[PDB]
Amino acid sequence: REVMANLTARVVGAARRGTLLEKRETVKSVALLVVTPDRGLCGSLVAN
Amino acid sequence: MEGLNLVATALAVGLGAIGPGVGIGIIVSGAVQAIGRNPEIENRVVTYMFIGIAFTEALAIFGLVIAFLIGF
Numbered sequence: 001r002e003v004m005a006n007l008t009a010r011v012v013g014a015a016r017r018g019t020l021l022e023k024r025e026t027v028k029s030v031a032l033l034v035v036t037p038d039r040g041l042c043g044s045l046v047a048n
Numbered sequence: 049m050e051g052l053n054l055v056a057t058a059l060a061v062g063l064g065a066i067g068p069g070v071g072i073g074i075i076v077s078g079a080v081q082a083i084g085r086n087p088e089i090e091n092r093v094v095t096y097m098f099i100g101i102a103f104t105e106a107l108a109i110f111g112l113v114i115a116f117l118i119g120f
């Protein structure tokens with residue numbers, strides 16, 4: 001995180017601001033990574 | 049002795065070819081590299097690129113000009 005903070009503070013206004021750092025406007029598709037337990041008996045955690 | 053004006057014109061035009069030629073080569077190489085790195089600014093740099101060539105061209109033209117001043 002510290003190295004990434006230094007690198008992001010270094011680069012400003014680049015060509016489409018990198019690739020993974022690109023603030024791509026007109027958002028049309030969002031992918032979600034949800035992490036859940038493999039087994040039950042957790043309580044309200046999986047439901048929450 | 050023969051006419052030294054021919055030798056003068058030849059030397060002037062040849063050196064005006066040597067100097068601005070290498071200058072233009074370096075300018076074009078640098079501009080091409082910069083365009084290949086950051087294309088999003090290319091117009092700005094290419095404008096500056098032409099400016100540099102202009103000055104080099106002027107120097108070469110200067111030699112040619114004085115070459116004509118020796119030619120006739």
